Design a protein around this nucleic acid. Structure first.
Lengths: 50, 329
RNA sequence: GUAAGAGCCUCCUUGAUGAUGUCAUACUUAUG
């Protein structure tokens, strides 16, 4: 019953679930890629463009 | 419109050129680091057995040999690196060292002799360089590169060791455990994956949508837990793995992560953990109390990392930042 | 059991703990 009510609050669906996992995973991948990119840009001046 | 016959005579005259118009410890800053470099510090190394000799790596692409502890002055200068060193490493005895250069050139360095060891290269730019624990021979070193495959490299044999891909993400760092049957591998995919290494097969992968990048990765001297500070400024302490669970220590927050990888520090009294902050402040943490200690700003620039003394009792903790380094008591 | 996508060929902040393994039960596999 608790999982049934939690599933009722989960009615957003697997599409919104994959959108949330894609938003958190995309934000983490952008924070890591922009992270290390900022660490490399702060030291060396040699970098390509996007 | 005019006549076409008149235009032919006008063109014929034009070709003829006719122009006719007719209760917590409160450590304080002890002394500044020996010498220094204008460029930001690339890596922070030290002698494992002695602890007095510290090898400072800077973005200037020149390995700085430093004598540090006591009668404070550095060691000597070390050159021969093609480009800025991406990672630093040293042997178990300390007389030998390894270098990871962003030129994609891994060059071993002899130190005590006054000059380096030899220049080597790899396939891609190595993102991690670490010595092999356990057996004191260690002809191979555990390393990683942008190729997203953790690879040990045999050196004294003239060629490398082996390459194994744990995850599709580029390996940020690799730290081998004492069991020698597994090596913690942190990758840019954010998934922390232990890897069985000496065997071409790895170990296991965990937590891809968590532990953002690998800003800090460290393990307790007792080996009971290994904590990793994450780019959300969220320090995730993982209980070390021998178990059905085989993970998960605790949660430690309060740090600051600007996205640059910071060297994790601790006081291994079974007491404290201290690391740098992304804003440059000195992050002091009480650990065994499940809560930290205090945040004391030290460096004026972005904090690169910090180091600690050997394990006897409370002594002192070194620190370093971009462009300068400062040791604290 | 599979349509799609990605890139590498010069100055600050409100303090709640942890390590000894086994059953009924829930979910995820193209190995029946």
């Amino acid at each position: 019953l608790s999982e049934a009510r939690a599933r009722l609050a989960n009615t957003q669906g697997k599409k919104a679930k994959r959108k949330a996992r894609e938003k958190q995973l995309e934000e983490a991948r952008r924070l890591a890629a922009l992270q290390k990119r900022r660490e490399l840009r702060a030291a060396g001046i040699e970098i390509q463009k996007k | 419109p005019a006549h076409i016959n008149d235009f032919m005579f006008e063109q014929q005259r034009r070709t003829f050129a006719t122009y006719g118009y007719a209760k917590c410890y409160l450590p304080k800053k002890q002394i500044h680091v020996w010498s220094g470099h204008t460029k930001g510090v690339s890596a922070v190394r030290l002698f494992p057995l002695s602890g007095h000799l510290l090898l400072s790596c800077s973005m200037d692409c020149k390995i700085k040999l430093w004598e540090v502890y006591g009668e404070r002055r550095c060691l000597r200068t070390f050159i021969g690196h093609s480009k800025a060193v991406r990672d630093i490493c040293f042997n178990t005895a300390g007389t030998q060292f390894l270098s990871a250069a962003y030129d994609r050139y891994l060059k071993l360095w002899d130190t005590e002799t006054g000059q380096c060891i030899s220049r080597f290269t790899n396939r891609k730019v190595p993102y991690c360089v670490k010595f092999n624990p356990d057996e004191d021979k260690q002809n191979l070193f555990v390393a990683g590169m942008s190729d997203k495959k953790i690879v040990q490299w045999d050196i004294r044999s003239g060629e490398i060791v082996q390459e194994y891909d744990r995850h599709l993400g580029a390996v940020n760092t690799i730290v081998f455990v004492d069991e020698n049957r597994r090596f913690v591998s942190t990758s840019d995919d954010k998934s922390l994956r232990v890897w069985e290494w000496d065997i071409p097969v790895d170990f296991k992968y965990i937590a891809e949508p968590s532990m953002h990048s690998m800003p800090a990765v460290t393990l307790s001297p007792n080996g009971k837990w290994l904590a990793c500070q994450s780019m959300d400024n969220q320090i995730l302490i993982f209980g070390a793995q021998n178990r059905f669970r085989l993970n998960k220590k605790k949660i430690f927050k309060g740090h600051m992560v600007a996205g640059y990888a910071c060297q994790v520090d601790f006081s291994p009294d079974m007491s404290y953990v201290i690391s740098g902050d992304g804003n440059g402040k000195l992050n002091i943490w009480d650990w065994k109390t499940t809560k930290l200690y205090s945040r004391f700003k030290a460096h004026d620039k972005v904090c690169i990392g910090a180091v600690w003394h050997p394990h006897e009792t409370s002594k002192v903790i070194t620190c370093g930042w971009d462009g300068l380094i400062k040791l604290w008591d």
